[PDB]
Amino acid sequence: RTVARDITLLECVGKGRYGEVWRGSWQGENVAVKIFSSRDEKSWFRETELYNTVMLRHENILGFIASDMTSRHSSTQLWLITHYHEMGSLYDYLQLTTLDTVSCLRIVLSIASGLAHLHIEIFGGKPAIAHRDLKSKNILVKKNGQCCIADLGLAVMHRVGTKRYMAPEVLDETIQVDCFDSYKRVDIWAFGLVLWEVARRMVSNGIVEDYKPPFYDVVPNDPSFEDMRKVVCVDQQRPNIPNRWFSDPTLTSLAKLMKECWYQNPSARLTALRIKKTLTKID
Numbered sequence: 001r002t003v004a005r006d007i008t009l010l011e012c013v014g015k016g017r018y019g020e021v022w023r024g025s026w027q028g029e030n031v032a033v034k035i036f037s038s039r040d041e042k043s044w045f046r047e048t049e050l051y052n053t054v055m056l057r058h059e060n061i062l063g064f065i066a067s068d069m070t071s072r073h074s075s076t077q078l079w080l081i082t083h084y085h086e087m088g089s090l091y092d093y094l095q096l097t098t099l100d101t102v103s104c105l106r107i108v109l110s111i112a113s114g115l116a117h118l119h120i121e122i123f124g125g126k127p128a129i130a131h132r133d134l135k136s137k138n139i140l141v142k143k144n145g146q147c148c149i150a151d152l153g154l155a156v157m158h159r160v161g162t163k164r165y166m167a168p169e170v171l172d173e174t175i176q177v178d179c180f181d182s183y184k185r186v187d188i189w190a191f192g193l194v195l196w197e198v199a200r201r202m203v204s205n206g207i208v209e210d211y212k213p214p215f216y217d218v219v220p221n222d223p224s225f226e227d228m229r230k231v232v233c234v235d236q237q238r239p240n241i242p243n244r245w246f247s248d249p250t251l252t253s254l255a256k257l258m259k260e261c262w263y264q265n266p267s268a269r270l271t272a273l274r275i276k277k278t279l280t281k282i283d
């Protein structure tokens with residue numbers, strides 16, 4: 001039989017230290033192709049090892065198609081091939097889109113749904129998985145208004161995370177490194193920050209905040225580890241809740257939720273399953 005492997009790369013939709021992401025075409029269909037830099041080969045290996053262990057399939061997890069290693073004269077070429085989401089990342093989308101109540105809740109409940117699927121051990125199934133780099137750039141927007149979580153290159157099964165999104169126990173190096181629940185609680189902190197990023201873009205009473213990243217008002221661009229530790233650990237700052245949220249029942253409930261993702265004590269934070277239940281009871 002014929003095995004048609006050729007993927008046509010059509011346009012670059014992302015370029016970074018990680019490497020590049022391309023829109024590509026296979027058998028008439030869009031795919032996304034991540035081409036890894038030599039510097040980030042371990043992310044390809046980790047994601048590949050995870051998908052070789054458990055073929056994750058969930059509407060709120062970026063859909064795996066293939067992992068390819070190709071021999072070159074003096075290098076190895078590493079590609080990850082996934083479903084393609086033409087609307088791009090949540091980070092992108094929030095820059096120049098505002099949200100209504102239904103669209104804001106749909107976005108955050110879909111993220112919670114994908115995160116709970118990662119976190120839960122299923123017997124018979126899947127190991128429990130912590131993401132370790134959850135942020136708005138690692139979430140894609142689907143045409144149906146739900147999102148999906150991307151990038152399992154740092155994931156752990158039962159490179160460091162993006163510093164802006166690191167929980168206090170990562171910054172002060174007190175995290176219980178041998179304890180798997182610790183890694184779930186790090187993801188919940190980062191989820192709370194994403195929830196704040198999204199909520200800001202939800203209109204109420206004709207008011208909306210501009211897109212900003214978490215801690216935009218207290219750290220520089222590309223904040224250092226120390227910059228983050230002073231804000232989050234020493235001063236124990238948290239993102240601002242605008243007064244206008246307290247006129248809106250949805251944003252009032254979301255503020256409460258994000259507070260319960262940001263406790264200094266990791267074991268006080270809500271679980272992804274409890275976040276889902278809370279979001280299903282809002283509106």
Ligand SMILES: COc1cc(-c2cncc(-c3ccc(C4CCN(C)CC4)cc3)c2C)cc(OC)c1OC
Nearest residue numbers: 001002003004005006007026031065066067068081
């Ligand atoms: C090697 O590399 C790539 C391959 C492909 C690809 C192309 N045509 C057909 C296939 C195929 C799938 C599955 C079977 C099954 C049939 C049932 N039988 C009981 C076991 C085997 C056969 C063939 C594949 C996997 C695409 C690629 O890119 C999208 C590849 O590159 C990453």
Ligand SMILES: COc1cc(-c2cncc(-c3ccc(C4CCN(C)CC4)cc3)c2C)cc(OC)c1OC
Nearest residue numbers: 002003004026027029030031064065066081082083
């Ligand atoms: C990698 O990705 C894609 C792959 C393919 C594809 C191409 N040839 C053959 C297959 C296939 C056929 C049959 C089986 C069997 C397995 C045993 N079981 C008891 C009955 C079924 C498995 C696999 C597929 C899945 C198509 C795709 O899109 C249309 C892919 O997506 C980009």
Ligand SMILES: COc1cc(-c2cncc(-c3ccc(C4CCN(C)CC4)cc3)c2C)cc(OC)c1OC
Nearest residue numbers: 013021032033034080082084085088089138150151
């Ligand atoms: C986070 O991580 C990964 C993401 C993706 C991925 C999947 N679908 C779509 C995208 C995308 C498409 C288009 C835009 C922009 C640029 C084009 N237009 C002018 C505006 C929109 C942005 C983003 C991406 C980047 C794939 C990955 O692996 C293959 C990723 O790594 C796991």
